[PDB]
Amino acid sequence: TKKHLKRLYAPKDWMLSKLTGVFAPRPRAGPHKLRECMTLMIIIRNRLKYALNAAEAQMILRQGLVCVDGKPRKDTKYPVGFMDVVEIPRTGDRFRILYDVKGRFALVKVGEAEGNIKLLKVENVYTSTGRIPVAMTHDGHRIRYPDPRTHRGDTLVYNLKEKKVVDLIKSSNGKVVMVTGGANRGRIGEIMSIERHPGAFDIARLKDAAGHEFATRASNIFVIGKDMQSVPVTLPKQQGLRINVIQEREEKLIAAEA
Amino acid sequence: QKKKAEVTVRTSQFKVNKLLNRKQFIVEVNHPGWCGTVPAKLIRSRLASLYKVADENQISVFGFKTKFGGGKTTGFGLIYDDLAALKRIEPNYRKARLGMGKKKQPARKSVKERRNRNKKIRG
Amino acid sequence: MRNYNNFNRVWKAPRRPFEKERLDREMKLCGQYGLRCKREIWRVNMTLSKMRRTARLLLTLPENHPRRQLEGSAIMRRCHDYGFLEEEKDKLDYVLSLTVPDILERRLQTVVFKHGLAKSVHHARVLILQRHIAVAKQIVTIPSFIVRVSSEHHIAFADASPFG
RNA sequence: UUAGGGUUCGAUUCCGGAGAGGGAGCCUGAGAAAUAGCUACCACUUCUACGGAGGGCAGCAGGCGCGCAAAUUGCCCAAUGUCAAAAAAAAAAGAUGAGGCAGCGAAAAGAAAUAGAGCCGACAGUGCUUUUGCAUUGUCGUUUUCAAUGGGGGAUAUUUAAACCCAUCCAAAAUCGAGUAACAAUUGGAGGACAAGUCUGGUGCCAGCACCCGCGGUAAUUCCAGCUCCAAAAGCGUAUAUUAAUGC
RNA sequence: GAUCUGGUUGAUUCUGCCAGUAGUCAUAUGCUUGUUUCAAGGACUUAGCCAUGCAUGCCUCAGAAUCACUGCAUUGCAGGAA
């Protein structure tokens, strides 16, 4: 059982430094995996800057002033992965974490009624006792009584105001879809095709807007909406389009002349 | 003599932190013609007039970084709302520069030695 | 343990140090530009060899290669800065025509003298280190500070200076 | 370390495995065949009014031994993490030789002081020249002279958990200080390889030098001294291993 | 920097090693140092033996207080040992 983590062996999507400190926090197990998560203390301290020190993050959280999933937390360490709404009511602000283009955690700011919306990808379906069907998700949530049309790897729109599931969205056909992991993170596009290799990983080919096709694993597909004009949730800072190295450098210079 | 030295204090990026009820403001200093480093007393006075605080008690500042060549300094400071909020929320050392800190705990070593001997006793 | 700070050498001694050819072309510099010791002449040599390595490697490549495109503009850009080459240069063969003096020439020690603020290079090295020079408004007391093409026209003197 | 191909190293900060004097066995626990948990044997080892009872530093310091060879029985939980019933504070601030800080530290690595300038005299080179003379550049020198600054001293202070280091300053009314700038650079070389002596004294196949080639038998460019000059420079020699040199 | 310099001979051209040569967070060692910035540091020779001290304990608003424990209170409250 591991209870310690070193800064280098920790993700640098948390944007820790080589120098200053030796350890990084190992979060308590929860909805999300160690690599894909970002621990509370990291967010509050290094990004939002409502804390300058570890101890100050305990001060805020133990007390309680912070909610995720609309539930208040007294937890110092807790995962925050993907499609999680966090709300600090003291500020009155609602963040929705996502994957920004270029592999960065996005923190995107939402209207208040969008922060009751959430999207969870389904992993398995199975029948449990009493013939009661269950969809188990990638956040470990159990949706009792899902629709009879549910399949593995589809999204379920999930009301956090009161817990239930309205209409689903499938991974079928061309639909607006975004990537999770694999270093095509936050890049958005239509499904062009879904290749099958049975007994092995199923490739899928995505085509983003303004062309430039590419390939990513089925496992890394996470649906957004029916269409780009039917999206239920906001996009991060960049729209889900990447640009060439040359153009990055060019634009960096142009703005620096101001 | 040929001049009067003055201490100029400014600020750059400001926060309102309602969670801890404090302000977080990156200070700048300039201090043209001032001899040596600027004592923190002056800075507290300038900041008082600037943010319309009636106290240098609520103003508590830590760290100052003197850039190479000439009189220059930059730093960071904290204003709090109430004086009760200050005492409670803030670290011991920061407070004790104002003289609002707590008395130091007895030496670490003597604690250890005694804390061991307490494991032996039954009452 | 647990140190994650790098160390690197910036200077190295050329092979066969008793070549009377090399000795000539050392003293010629170190006396003229007022350099402290040979270590300085070598320090610039290294950084120049480095630059010239990547430029050679880029030049090899066919046109419209990403390495060529991106990193070509960068090498050129930073020789426009510091005034090593002018803005009529683009080839990455110009970059390979750089030699040791053109570096030394743009060090603060020489730039001070050449702009008319000292009477010798030796004398301008003192003017630096007695904290009585600036490079726009920032007091620099290092003679090996390489001066931008823009900022060699704003040198002035320190505001701590009895000469200013 | 190498242009390339390669060559060689990995005890050691991160990840993985294994171990806690040598072996084996076991309990508890979700997880252990745990060793600052237990049981036994063996090699050691500490107390005892000798009836008995203990010990395991390859945890941090420290001691002995070992070898060519390696730091303080220091300060702190402020930071970074962890453990917990646990936010802080309220009379009222949990623990941590994990970890941070300082001491010691020419392994290694970055920056940089030991001077700079005007007059006079001497020397060399170039141009013009009536050969008298003039101009320019560089060097050296006197009881020559002029400014400026750090090393160092101190603080209205500041850094830090506390205190230092760095930095900023010598009044803002009020605060130090170089002229042989004694605040004085050394370690190896000058026959060849290999940058630098047509030197002077001493020694005379002795003493010694010499990686190698070779020097020394009274005429030493190499030894032992002095002066002179050279290379690198706050670093420079020597030993061993390894890589380049090697298409050996 | 894709580097061949001395040594076999009366003199010469080869083969061929030896010696010279530059690096090493690679260790030891001699001599010498006025400051700053950054650091490895009992691995190598015995995973040899160890004096002494210290190195994981922990409770709020919320599991158990009649310390014959302390204050405020006067058959009521708050701290609070182990």
Side-chain angles (χ1 to χ4, degrees), chain B residues 80-100:
Chain B
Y80 278 80
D81 295 299
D82 307 298
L83 192 58
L86 179 68
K87 292 187 171 63
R88 178 172 286 105
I89 296 173
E90 194 174 67
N92 200 66
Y93 60 100
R94 302 181 185 169
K95 294 186 299 178
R97 297 174 184 185
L98 304 171
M100 296 181 172

PDB file of all heavy atoms in Angstrom, chain B residues 80-100:
ATOM      1  N   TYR B  80      -6.202  42.380   6.325  1.00  0.00           N
ATOM      2  CA  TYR B  80      -7.239  41.498   6.786  1.00  0.00           C
ATOM      3  C   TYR B  80      -8.339  42.429   7.191  1.00  0.00           C
ATOM      4  O   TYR B  80      -8.144  43.640   7.295  1.00  0.00           O
ATOM      5  CB  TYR B  80      -6.843  40.665   8.034  1.00  0.00           C
ATOM      6  CG  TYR B  80      -6.043  39.453   7.641  1.00  0.00           C
ATOM      7  CD1 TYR B  80      -4.672  39.547   7.345  1.00  0.00           C
ATOM      8  CD2 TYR B  80      -6.657  38.188   7.604  1.00  0.00           C
ATOM      9  CE1 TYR B  80      -3.924  38.400   7.051  1.00  0.00           C
ATOM     10  CE2 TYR B  80      -5.915  37.041   7.299  1.00  0.00           C
ATOM     11  CZ  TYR B  80      -4.544  37.143   7.030  1.00  0.00           C
ATOM     12  OH  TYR B  80      -3.785  35.984   6.747  1.00  0.00           O
ATOM     13  N   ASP B  81      -9.543  41.861   7.409  1.00  0.00           N
ATOM     14  CA  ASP B  81     -10.736  42.597   7.734  1.00  0.00           C
ATOM     15  C   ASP B  81     -11.098  42.105   9.093  1.00  0.00           C
ATOM     16  O   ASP B  81     -11.044  40.905   9.343  1.00  0.00           O
ATOM     17  CB  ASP B  81     -11.909  42.304   6.769  1.00  0.00           C
ATOM     18  CG  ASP B  81     -11.532  42.793   5.373  1.00  0.00           C
ATOM     19  OD1 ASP B  81     -11.299  44.022   5.222  1.00  0.00           O
ATOM     20  OD2 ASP B  81     -11.466  41.949   4.441  1.00  0.00           O
ATOM     21  N   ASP B  82     -11.436  43.049  10.006  1.00  0.00           N
ATOM     22  CA  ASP B  82     -11.347  42.901  11.446  1.00  0.00           C
ATOM     23  C   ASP B  82      -9.895  42.854  11.859  1.00  0.00           C
ATOM     24  O   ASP B  82      -9.001  43.095  11.050  1.00  0.00           O
ATOM     25  CB  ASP B  82     -12.125  41.705  12.073  1.00  0.00           C
ATOM     26  CG  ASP B  82     -13.585  41.726  11.621  1.00  0.00           C
ATOM     27  OD1 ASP B  82     -14.288  42.723  11.936  1.00  0.00           O
ATOM     28  OD2 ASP B  82     -14.016  40.744  10.958  1.00  0.00           O
ATOM     29  N   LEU B  83      -9.647  42.684  13.175  1.00  0.00           N
ATOM     30  CA  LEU B  83      -8.340  42.389  13.705  1.00  0.00           C
ATOM     31  C   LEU B  83      -8.352  40.998  14.275  1.00  0.00           C
ATOM     32  O   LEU B  83      -7.300  40.413  14.526  1.00  0.00           O
ATOM     33  CB  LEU B  83      -7.949  43.415  14.798  1.00  0.00           C
ATOM     34  CG  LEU B  83      -6.464  43.396  15.238  1.00  0.00           C
ATOM     35  CD1 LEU B  83      -5.493  43.642  14.068  1.00  0.00           C
ATOM     36  CD2 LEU B  83      -6.215  44.409  16.372  1.00  0.00           C
ATOM     37  N   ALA B  84      -9.554  40.385  14.400  1.00  0.00           N
ATOM     38  CA  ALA B  84      -9.717  39.086  15.005  1.00  0.00           C
ATOM     39  C   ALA B  84      -9.323  38.055  13.984  1.00  0.00           C
ATOM     40  O   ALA B  84      -8.557  37.140  14.283  1.00  0.00           O
ATOM     41  CB  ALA B  84     -11.174  38.822  15.427  1.00  0.00           C
ATOM     42  N   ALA B  85      -9.810  38.238  12.729  1.00  0.00           N
ATOM     43  CA  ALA B  85      -9.458  37.483  11.547  1.00  0.00           C
ATOM     44  C   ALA B  85      -7.974  37.351  11.326  1.00  0.00           C
ATOM     45  O   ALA B  85      -7.503  36.277  10.967  1.00  0.00           O
ATOM     46  CB  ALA B  85     -10.054  38.082  10.265  1.00  0.00           C
ATOM     47  N   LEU B  86      -7.212  38.461  11.527  1.00  0.00           N
ATOM     48  CA  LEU B  86      -5.766  38.505  11.441  1.00  0.00           C
ATOM     49  C   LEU B  86      -5.150  37.495  12.365  1.00  0.00           C
ATOM     50  O   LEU B  86      -4.562  36.523  11.899  1.00  0.00           O
ATOM     51  CB  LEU B  86      -5.199  39.901  11.793  1.00  0.00           C
ATOM     52  CG  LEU B  86      -3.655  40.029  11.746  1.00  0.00           C
ATOM     53  CD1 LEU B  86      -3.092  39.913  10.320  1.00  0.00           C
ATOM     54  CD2 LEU B  86      -3.208  41.341  12.405  1.00  0.00           C
ATOM     55  N   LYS B  87      -5.349  37.678  13.694  1.00  0.00           N
ATOM     56  CA  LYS B  87      -4.814  36.847  14.749  1.00  0.00           C
ATOM     57  C   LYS B  87      -5.075  35.375  14.543  1.00  0.00           C
ATOM     58  O   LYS B  87      -4.180  34.545  14.678  1.00  0.00           O
ATOM     59  CB  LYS B  87      -5.335  37.249  16.145  1.00  0.00           C
ATOM     60  CG  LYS B  87      -4.810  38.621  16.597  1.00  0.00           C
ATOM     61  CD  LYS B  87      -5.185  38.946  18.051  1.00  0.00           C
ATOM     62  CE  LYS B  87      -4.493  40.198  18.607  1.00  0.00           C
ATOM     63  NZ  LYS B  87      -4.896  41.414  17.865  1.00  0.00           N
ATOM     64  N   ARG B  88      -6.341  35.020  14.240  1.00  0.00           N
ATOM     65  CA  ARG B  88      -6.740  33.659  14.001  1.00  0.00           C
ATOM     66  C   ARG B  88      -6.091  33.007  12.802  1.00  0.00           C
ATOM     67  O   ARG B  88      -5.420  31.988  12.951  1.00  0.00           O
ATOM     68  CB  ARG B  88      -8.274  33.646  13.820  1.00  0.00           C
ATOM     69  CG  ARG B  88      -8.915  32.289  13.497  1.00  0.00           C
ATOM     70  CD  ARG B  88     -10.451  32.332  13.537  1.00  0.00           C
ATOM     71  NE  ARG B  88     -10.913  32.392  14.969  1.00  0.00           N
ATOM     72  CZ  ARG B  88     -11.402  33.518  15.576  1.00  0.00           C
ATOM     73  NH1 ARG B  88     -11.537  34.694  14.901  1.00  0.00           N
ATOM     74  NH2 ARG B  88     -11.751  33.459  16.896  1.00  0.00           N
ATOM     75  N   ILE B  89      -6.258  33.595  11.593  1.00  0.00           N
ATOM     76  CA  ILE B  89      -5.931  32.949  10.336  1.00  0.00           C
ATOM     77  C   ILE B  89      -4.449  32.901  10.051  1.00  0.00           C
ATOM     78  O   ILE B  89      -3.972  31.992   9.371  1.00  0.00           O
ATOM     79  CB  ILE B  89      -6.693  33.636   9.197  1.00  0.00           C
ATOM     80  CG1 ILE B  89      -8.214  33.429   9.424  1.00  0.00           C
ATOM     81  CG2 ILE B  89      -6.259  33.129   7.799  1.00  0.00           C
ATOM     82  CD1 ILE B  89      -9.108  34.195   8.448  1.00  0.00           C
ATOM     83  N   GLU B  90      -3.675  33.876  10.571  1.00  0.00           N
ATOM     84  CA  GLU B  90      -2.328  34.098  10.109  1.00  0.00           C
ATOM     85  C   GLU B  90      -1.349  33.237  10.881  1.00  0.00           C
ATOM     86  O   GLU B  90      -1.562  33.058  12.079  1.00  0.00           O
ATOM     87  CB  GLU B  90      -1.946  35.589  10.271  1.00  0.00           C
ATOM     88  CG  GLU B  90      -0.672  35.985   9.516  1.00  0.00           C
ATOM     89  CD  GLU B  90      -0.448  37.489   9.601  1.00  0.00           C
ATOM     90  OE1 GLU B  90      -0.181  37.990  10.726  1.00  0.00           O
ATOM     91  OE2 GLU B  90      -0.531  38.155   8.534  1.00  0.00           O
ATOM     92  N   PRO B  91      -0.272  32.699  10.277  1.00  0.00           N
ATOM     93  CA  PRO B  91       0.869  32.079  10.944  1.00  0.00           C
ATOM     94  C   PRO B  91       1.436  32.851  12.108  1.00  0.00           C
ATOM     95  O   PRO B  91       1.207  34.054  12.203  1.00  0.00           O
ATOM     96  CB  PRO B  91       1.904  31.912   9.833  1.00  0.00           C
ATOM     97  CG  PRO B  91       1.046  31.609   8.607  1.00  0.00           C
ATOM     98  CD  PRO B  91      -0.178  32.504   8.826  1.00  0.00           C
ATOM     99  N   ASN B  92       2.123  32.143  13.032  1.00  0.00           N
ATOM    100  CA  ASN B  92       2.647  32.678  14.265  1.00  0.00           C
ATOM    101  C   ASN B  92       3.704  33.727  14.048  1.00  0.00           C
ATOM    102  O   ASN B  92       3.654  34.776  14.685  1.00  0.00           O
ATOM    103  CB  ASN B  92       3.222  31.560  15.167  1.00  0.00           C
ATOM    104  CG  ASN B  92       3.320  32.045  16.622  1.00  0.00           C
ATOM    105  OD1 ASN B  92       2.288  32.297  17.255  1.00  0.00           O
ATOM    106  ND2 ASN B  92       4.576  32.179  17.142  1.00  0.00           N
ATOM    107  N   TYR B  93       4.664  33.485  13.126  1.00  0.00           N
ATOM    108  CA  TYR B  93       5.848  34.301  12.991  1.00  0.00           C
ATOM    109  C   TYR B  93       5.513  35.681  12.473  1.00  0.00           C
ATOM    110  O   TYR B  93       5.996  36.670  13.016  1.00  0.00           O
ATOM    111  CB  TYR B  93       6.970  33.647  12.143  1.00  0.00           C
ATOM    112  CG  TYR B  93       6.587  33.322  10.718  1.00  0.00           C
ATOM    113  CD1 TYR B  93       6.980  34.175   9.671  1.00  0.00           C
ATOM    114  CD2 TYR B  93       5.879  32.149  10.408  1.00  0.00           C
ATOM    115  CE1 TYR B  93       6.677  33.862   8.342  1.00  0.00           C
ATOM    116  CE2 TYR B  93       5.570  31.835   9.080  1.00  0.00           C
ATOM    117  CZ  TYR B  93       5.973  32.687   8.045  1.00  0.00           C
ATOM    118  OH  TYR B  93       5.672  32.361   6.704  1.00  0.00           O
ATOM    119  N   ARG B  94       4.661  35.759  11.418  1.00  0.00           N
ATOM    120  CA  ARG B  94       4.111  36.965  10.830  1.00  0.00           C
ATOM    121  C   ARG B  94       3.494  37.884  11.853  1.00  0.00           C
ATOM    122  O   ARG B  94       3.845  39.060  11.926  1.00  0.00           O
ATOM    123  CB  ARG B  94       3.047  36.648   9.762  1.00  0.00           C
ATOM    124  CG  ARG B  94       3.577  35.773   8.616  1.00  0.00           C
ATOM    125  CD  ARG B  94       2.504  35.489   7.560  1.00  0.00           C
ATOM    126  NE  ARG B  94       3.057  34.527   6.553  1.00  0.00           N
ATOM    127  CZ  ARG B  94       2.271  33.922   5.611  1.00  0.00           C
ATOM    128  NH1 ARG B  94       0.946  34.231   5.497  1.00  0.00           N
ATOM    129  NH2 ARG B  94       2.821  32.997   4.771  1.00  0.00           N
ATOM    130  N   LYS B  95       2.563  37.338  12.675  1.00  0.00           N
ATOM    131  CA  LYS B  95       1.975  37.972  13.838  1.00  0.00           C
ATOM    132  C   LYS B  95       2.983  38.551  14.791  1.00  0.00           C
ATOM    133  O   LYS B  95       2.815  39.678  15.232  1.00  0.00           O
ATOM    134  CB  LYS B  95       1.067  37.047  14.668  1.00  0.00           C
ATOM    135  CG  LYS B  95      -0.199  36.613  13.926  1.00  0.00           C
ATOM    136  CD  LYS B  95      -1.168  35.824  14.817  1.00  0.00           C
ATOM    137  CE  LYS B  95      -0.606  34.512  15.384  1.00  0.00           C
ATOM    138  NZ  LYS B  95      -1.593  33.846  16.265  1.00  0.00           N
ATOM    139  N   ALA B  96       4.031  37.773  15.153  1.00  0.00           N
ATOM    140  CA  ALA B  96       4.981  38.094  16.196  1.00  0.00           C
ATOM    141  C   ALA B  96       5.968  39.171  15.810  1.00  0.00           C
ATOM    142  O   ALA B  96       6.723  39.646  16.657  1.00  0.00           O
ATOM    143  CB  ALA B  96       5.797  36.852  16.599  1.00  0.00           C
ATOM    144  N   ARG B  97       6.019  39.548  14.510  1.00  0.00           N
ATOM    145  CA  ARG B  97       6.686  40.735  14.019  1.00  0.00           C
ATOM    146  C   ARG B  97       5.930  41.987  14.397  1.00  0.00           C
ATOM    147  O   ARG B  97       6.538  43.033  14.618  1.00  0.00           O
ATOM    148  CB  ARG B  97       6.883  40.699  12.485  1.00  0.00           C
ATOM    149  CG  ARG B  97       7.788  39.535  12.040  1.00  0.00           C
ATOM    150  CD  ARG B  97       7.902  39.376  10.516  1.00  0.00           C
ATOM    151  NE  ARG B  97       8.738  38.160  10.229  1.00  0.00           N
ATOM    152  CZ  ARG B  97       9.104  37.793   8.963  1.00  0.00           C
ATOM    153  NH1 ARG B  97       8.722  38.525   7.877  1.00  0.00           N
ATOM    154  NH2 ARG B  97       9.871  36.677   8.783  1.00  0.00           N
ATOM    155  N   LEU B  98       4.580  41.910  14.484  1.00  0.00           N
ATOM    156  CA  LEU B  98       3.755  42.956  15.049  1.00  0.00           C
ATOM    157  C   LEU B  98       3.762  42.874  16.557  1.00  0.00           C
ATOM    158  O   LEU B  98       3.555  43.881  17.233  1.00  0.00           O
ATOM    159  CB  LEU B  98       2.268  42.848  14.625  1.00  0.00           C
ATOM    160  CG  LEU B  98       2.014  42.832  13.102  1.00  0.00           C
ATOM    161  CD1 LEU B  98       0.538  42.501  12.823  1.00  0.00           C
ATOM    162  CD2 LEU B  98       2.420  44.150  12.417  1.00  0.00           C
ATOM    163  N   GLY B  99       3.995  41.663  17.117  1.00  0.00           N
ATOM    164  CA  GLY B  99       3.989  41.418  18.539  1.00  0.00           C
ATOM    165  C   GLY B  99       2.627  40.959  18.967  1.00  0.00           C
ATOM    166  O   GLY B  99       2.149  41.345  20.032  1.00  0.00           O
ATOM    167  N   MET B 100       1.951  40.158  18.108  1.00  0.00           N
ATOM    168  CA  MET B 100       0.659  39.574  18.386  1.00  0.00           C
ATOM    169  C   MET B 100       0.768  38.073  18.417  1.00  0.00           C
ATOM    170  O   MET B 100      -0.245  37.381  18.518  1.00  0.00           O
ATOM    171  CB  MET B 100      -0.370  39.941  17.292  1.00  0.00           C
ATOM    172  CG  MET B 100      -0.661  41.449  17.235  1.00  0.00           C
ATOM    173  SD  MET B 100      -1.882  41.900  15.968  1.00  0.00           S
ATOM    174  CE  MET B 100      -2.003  43.627  16.513  1.00  0.00           C
TER     175      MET B 100
END
